[PDB]
Design a protein around this ligand. Structure first.
Ligand SMILES: Cc1cc2nc3c(=O)[nH]c(=O)nc-3n(C[C@H](O)[C@H](O)[C@H](O)COP(=O)(O)O)c2cc1C
Ligand code: SF4
Ligand code: SF4
Ligand code: SF4
Ligand code: FES
Ligand code: FES
Ligand SMILES: [Ca+2]
Lengths: 905, 156, 148
């Protein structure tokens, strides 16, 4: 299409509206109610331009650019005097009731309303009457509410209800008394409620966790990082001030997470700021805990390791690829053990084999929204891979999108699309041990044990393809439900099969692979998604190694007398008594970690490792994409006694001091080169980000904005002499403002979005190739493996149906977005959001045991009689006890296990 | 707490039969609850939402959008005087002042005995016979300030 | 009409099924706007909708919908019963048929009369409304409601 803006010719997409087309061209049109991910509704009336009928037209008329298609031969003017006057008048009308709040408002300096007030040129107030006022609501521990600042742009309700499918936020009242919030005080129930603080263009919805230690956007030190709280790999911009992690902002990745995070990623960062974190190397000498610097810690550890007869290393899926590789190089490949249990390792390696050998394409997180039917087997996605659940909700809305496209409705006219679609949706079928949060939009939900969910998957695969193994013993009603799923999946152009390792069942993953293979054999464009457990579960699976049980066996038999545990608490993957006994038997325990864990009491040496905020590295997400995270700040800048290094730096220096008796702190690119030289399956992590020599016209990439303040005073109380700028030899970023963050700079790692005149998250428009698309020079992160040419065979190991044995209680896993992840559950703001510990019981089982809801019952696992209160689960099948995985005292390895003597305390 | 009565629930499902989407019975469900209890209390929002299968935020948005759905307690009789343009020409201000004097309450308020609540309302579609008022279900036209106390006695 | 077969199933034996409901409002002036009317009928807040699409293609619950005033639908049966030629020759004006017109507000006879299009406002004011009341002089008038 061809448009003429202010007498200048432009080539645009005709299927776009004029606002997103002009913003993609670099032109500035003020806007409030439009969002790239939410569509156009034409509410705020801010985006007025003057449209002319033809070239020889001087009158024109004011139109909404967001509601006007960018059709071929379209003549508009942005800088027309009447259009500018009307846009200024719209800002002025918004300003009549706006509170005098910018100094005490958390949005200030990051506020889209401030930016558009300045952009329209409105700075003189002639309104003299009263301003309307609203009372605020309590919205829970994450979101702070201030309705005075609302401009009634309806972005919050459109995102929360129409996009995120939330139910507890709405708009109330009428005329100028419209109110946006909950129907009563309470916590916002959506797992994606935290995106309101970026969706809202004003300071109505703000980050309460950031508000506690508030600082302005210009004062932040930003880095591009990867969220560490699950396996999805959403791109984040952590921002630090005064040595503490202050905020997690969304970093736009047009391939993975685009505009949105989940609440665990956004608000679960508080473990970085915990005061009990190790900051120096500490050696246990008898009952004394002496503090070492880096060099003598390396020398003492190297001497003791040299005296040892066999050193084993226990990695973790929390640690990066480089850290796990450095531990593997320190101890040797045959002495390296993954820190996860044997069953978890089997499930993770099966998921990896399905992903990189199954011949079925695995989609990125944005690509999930383009699928026409979804079958989720076993994986409680909202509690384990939440952003996948949000993308699945978008894929469900795809049917209304297609129906509206059949009626020649433009794809941005979202209200017309929703009106045409009504309650029609693409088919979604979820299976779990109980109800999920996707049940509101799912075409069907199967509440069954993991064996029965696997049998349902195998039956679906057999009915799709007769070469798949059959299932004997399916009831006719379950058969009818299976047939419903089969005709929904067979008639889909793009079916998607989602599973993962969190169900605790190998057979669930096998059944999902069988369904995907059966759909691939019929010629469908089938995709498969595997949800892993942790941020680098897939990287640890690719690297490989022995299980934690084998490492504990080596420690117990005395074959290994030295153990180096990297970033692993070891209690989530094995019983605490066995771990404690094996670690007490070992004459040397060294723990390299950034969190004070329970195994540090028996540790002979503790190395103060860096968390993700203080370290660089690579993590492989659930789709196999290698992504680099960069260090946010120097931990030694304020506290000069802090010796907190990257885990790979500690382990490389330990290996060098063990070999040549000399220290070697090395560089990140050297470790990455060693990884890609030694492990060819991880060769793609080299191209996840450019090396430390990368420059934009000779200059590095700035971590902090150009208006960063307090350089000669932030450390003045410690010393009036300003310290040296922290040097970054590892990456291409600099720990200063003296660098490049231009939106036109040829790079893919953007620490934060800022453009002149766009101080809010709307500056990501300037950083994109087209608005709502990808980053201008490509989204960061590369895929490790391509889709294989040939697939796997059908898995013939169809399990038998679940049978409740008397006196034995099968543990059904229950996951929680707030509580199941280890580091995020250590965050203090999550404790209020955390559910109270519980045990779920069937009504028949609770009546048989003579217990009601709330009564405290006790059970013994690995010789630990623990007591929990009972709540009644309607959807749980009898013979099962529902336990909250990943919580304190309940390890995630308990999923699929069995319970004895479960009786009332 | 709030519990929907059997008659209210049955009327709500009967209204749900009239449409292809049960959300379309939200206004009439709120009106049914208001007709039974004078107004719509806070628990009625959640009850109507549970019966209709729609979120409580949507029911509250509907209830607070429409002016004749009362989300605050009202008196036994709701006086609604027209304050629109033709009744302004015909002199609704004298009628309003007579109501002020007789009831001793401002518009939007309720009398101390809970007998009356005074409310302005938009044009009642009776402009040729103005000024107009609407007590609970009866519209009174050709109003004069002298006839207002006589009109208010027949609503006990 | 339902008891006499004018409404319901098989009206006049023609096989046409038509059910007529009465939806009572809850008091907002914006509900008369046709797309806001459709939103209110669906049980939502009565915000209007952007056009296009018009309700004829996707209106109530996404279906084809036609919204018409009471007086238009009341003009329909006389057109169908007496014919097009009678309706065109009601008056010699560009707007065909009769219209309910009136005058209100401190006139001698405020009311409503069915008049052909092209009737002057002076004819309605004096010959039908009786002019202004005694002691009052004409100052202004609004032709078609508060929004004119
Ligand atoms: C704010 C607003 C309120 C309206 N209220 C009414 C109304 O109460 N009754 C009505 O028939 N039309 C009303 N209309 C006009 C309708 O939008 C629509 O044109 C009409 O109801 C049906 O069209 P018709 O005149 O061809 O029958 C209103 C329009 C607006 C903008
Ligand atoms: S929302 Fe924006 S304009 Fe309003 S007080 Fe806050 S910073 Fe100022
Ligand atoms: S609360 Fe924020 S997002 Fe919602 S309408 Fe008001 S300004 Fe817009
Ligand atoms: S979905 Fe996972 S990776 Fe993404 S923000 Fe949430 S916890 Fe982080
Ligand atoms: S952005 Fe177009 S009217 Fe709001
Ligand atoms: S102006 Fe009062 S009834 Fe119409
Ligand atoms: Ca570094």
């Amino acid at each position: 299409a061809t448009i003429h803006v202010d007498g200048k010719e432009y080539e645009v997409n005709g299927a776009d509206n004029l606002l997103e087309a002009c913003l993609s061209l670099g032109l500035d049109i003020p806007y409030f109610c439009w969002h790239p991910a939410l569509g156009s509704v034409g509410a705020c009336r801010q985006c007025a331009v003057k449209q002319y009928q033809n070239a020889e037209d001087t009158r024109g008329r004011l139109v909404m650019s967001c509601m006007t298609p960018a059709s071929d031969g379209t003549f508009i003017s942005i800088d027309d005097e009447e259009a500018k006057q009307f846009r200024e008048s719209v800002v002025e009308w918004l300003m009549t009731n706006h509170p005098h709040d910018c100094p005490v408002c958390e949005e200030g300096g990051n506020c889209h309303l401030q930016d558009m007030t300045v952009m329209t040129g409105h700075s003189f107030r002639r309104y003299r009457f009263t301003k309307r006022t609203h009372r605020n609501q309590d919205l829970g521990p994450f979101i702070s509410h201030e309705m005075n600042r609302c401009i009634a742009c309806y972005r919050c309700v459109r995102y929360y209800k129409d996009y995120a499918d939330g139910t507890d936020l709405g708009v109330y009242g009428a005329h100028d008394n419209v109110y946006f919030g909950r129907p009563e005080d309470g916590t916002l129930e959506s797992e994606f409620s935290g995106n309101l603080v970026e969706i809202c263009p004003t300071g109505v919805f703000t980050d309460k966790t950031h508000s506690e230690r508030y600082n302005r956007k210009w004062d932040m030190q930003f880095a591009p990082s990867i969220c560490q709280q699950c396996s999805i790999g959403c791109n984040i911009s952590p921002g630090e001030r005064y040595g503490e992690l202050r905020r997690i902002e969304n970093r736009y990745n047009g391939t993975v997470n685009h505009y949105f995070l989940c609440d665990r990623g956004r608000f679960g960062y508080g473990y970085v700021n915990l005061k009990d974190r190790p900051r120096q190397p500490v050696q246990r000498r008898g009952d004394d805990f002496i503090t070492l610097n880096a060099e003598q810690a390396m020398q003492g550890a190297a001497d003791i390791l040299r005296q040892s007869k066999k050193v084993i290393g226990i990695g973790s899926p929390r640690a990066s690829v480089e850290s796990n590789f450095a531990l593997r190089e320190l101890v040797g490949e045959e002495n390296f053990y993954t820190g996860i249990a044997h069953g978890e390792q089997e499930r993770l390696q099966l998921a990896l084999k399905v992903l990189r050998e199954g011949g079925i394409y695995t989609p990125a997180l944005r690509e999930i929204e383009s699928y026409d039917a979804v079958l989720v087997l076993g994986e409680d996605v909202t509690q384990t891979g939440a952003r996948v659940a949000l993308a699945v909700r978008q894929a469900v809305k795809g049917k209304a999108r297609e129906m509206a496209a059949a009626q020649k409705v433009a794809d941005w006219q979202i209200a017309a699309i929703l009106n045409i679609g009504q309650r029609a949706k693409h088919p979604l079928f979820v299976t779990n041990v109980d109800d999920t949060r996707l049940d509101d939009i799912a075409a069907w939900t199967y509440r069954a044990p993991v064996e029965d969910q696997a049998r349902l998957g195998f039956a679906i695969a057999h009915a799709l393809d007769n070469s798949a193994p059959a299932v004997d013993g399916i009831e006719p009603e379950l058969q009818s439900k299976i047939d419903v799923i089969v005709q929904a999946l067979a008639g889909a152009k793009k079916p998607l099969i989602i599973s993962g390792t969190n169900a605790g069942s190998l057979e669930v993953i096998q059944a999902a692979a069988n369904v995907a293979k059966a759909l691939k054999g019929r010629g469908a464009d089938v995709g498969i998604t595997m949800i892993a457990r942790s941020v680098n579960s897939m990287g640890l699976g690719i690297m490989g190694g022995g299980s934690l049980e084998e490492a504990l066996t080596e420690l117990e038999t005395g074959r290994a007398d030295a153990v180096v545990v990297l970033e692993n608490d070891l209690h989530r993957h094995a019983s605490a008594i066995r771990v404690n006994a094996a670690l007490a038997k070992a004459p040397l325990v060294m723990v390299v970690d950034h969190q004070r864990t329970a195994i540090m009491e028996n540790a002979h040496l503790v190395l103060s490792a860096a968390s993700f905020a203080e370290s660089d590295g690579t993590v492989i997400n659930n789709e196999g994409r290698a992504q680099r995270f960069f260090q946010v700040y120097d931990p030694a800048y304020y506290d000069s006694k802090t010796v907190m290094l990257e885990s790979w730096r500690w382990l490389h220096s330990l290996h060098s001091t063990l070999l040549s008796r000399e220290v070697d702190w090395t560089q990140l690119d050297h470790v990455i080169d060693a990884v890609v030289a030694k492990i060819p399956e991880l060769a793609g992590i080299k191209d996840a980000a450019p090396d430390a020599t990368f420059r934009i016209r000779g200059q590095k990439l700035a971590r902090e904005p150009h208006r960063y303040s307090g350089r000669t005073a932030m450390r003045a109380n410690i010393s009036v002499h300003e310290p040296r700028q922290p040097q970054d030899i590892d990456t291409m970023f600099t720990f200063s403002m003296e660098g490049n963050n231009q939106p036109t700079a040829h790079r893919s790692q953007v620490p934060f979005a800022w453009a002149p005149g766009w101080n809010s998250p709307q500056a990501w428009n300037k950083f994109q190739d087209e608005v709502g698309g990808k980053l201008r020079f490509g989204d960061p992160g590369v895929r490790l493996f391509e889709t294989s040419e040939n697939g796997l065979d059908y898995f013939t190991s169809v399990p038998a149906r679940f049978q409740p044995q008397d006196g034995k209680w099968r543990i059904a896993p229950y996951y929680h977005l707030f509580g199941s992840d280890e580091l995020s559950q250590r965050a203090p703001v999550f404790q209020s959001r955390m559910p109270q510990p519980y045990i779920k019981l069937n009504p028949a089982d609770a009546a048989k045991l003579g217990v009601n809801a709330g009564t405290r019952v006790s059970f013994s696992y690995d010789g630990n009689t623990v007591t929990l209160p009972v709540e009644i689960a309607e959807g749980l099948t009898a013979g099962q006890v529902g336990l909250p995985m990943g919580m304190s005292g309940i390890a995630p390895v308990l999923a699929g296990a069995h319970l004895e003597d479960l009786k009332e305390a | 707490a709030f519990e929907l009565s059997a008659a209210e629930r049955e009327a709500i499902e009967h209204e749900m039969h009239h449409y292809e989407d049960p959300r379309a019975a939200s206004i009439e469900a709120l009106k049914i609850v208001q007709k039974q209890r004078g107004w719509v209390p806070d628990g009625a929002i959640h009850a109507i939402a549970d019966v209709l299968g729609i979120p409580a935020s949507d029911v509250e948005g509907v209830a607070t959008f429409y002016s004749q759905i009362f989300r605050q307690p009202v008196g036994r009789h709701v006086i609604r005087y027209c304050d629109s343009v033709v009744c302004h020409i015909n002199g609704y201000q004298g009628i309003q002042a007579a109501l002020e004097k007789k009831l001793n309450i401002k518009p939007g308020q309720t009398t101390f005995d809970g007998r009356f609540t005074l409310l302005p309302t938009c044009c009642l579609g009776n402009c040729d016979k103005g000024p107009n008022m609407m007590i609970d279900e009866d519209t009174h036209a050709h109003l004069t300030p002298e006839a207002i106390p006589e009109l208010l006695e027949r609503y006990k | 009409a339902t008891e006499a077969g004018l409404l319901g199933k098989n009206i006049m034996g023609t096989g046409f099924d038509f059910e007529l409901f009465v939806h009572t409002g809850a008091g907002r002036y914006i509900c008369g706007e046709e797309t806001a009317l459709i939103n209110s009928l669906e049980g939502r807040r009565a915000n209007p909708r952007s056009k296009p699409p018009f309700p004829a293609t996707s209106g109530a619950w996404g279906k084809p919908t036609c919204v018409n005033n009471v007086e238009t639908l009341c003009n329909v049966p006389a057109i169908l019963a007496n014919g097009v030629e009678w309706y065109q020759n009601i008056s010699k004006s560009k707007d065909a048929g009769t219209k309910l017109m009136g005058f209100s507000g401190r006139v001698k006879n405020p009311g409503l009369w069915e008049l052909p299009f092209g009737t002057t406002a002076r004819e309605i004011l004096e010959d039908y409304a009786g002019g202004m009341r005694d002691g009052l002089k004409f100052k202004a008038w609004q032709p078609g409601g508060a929004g004119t």
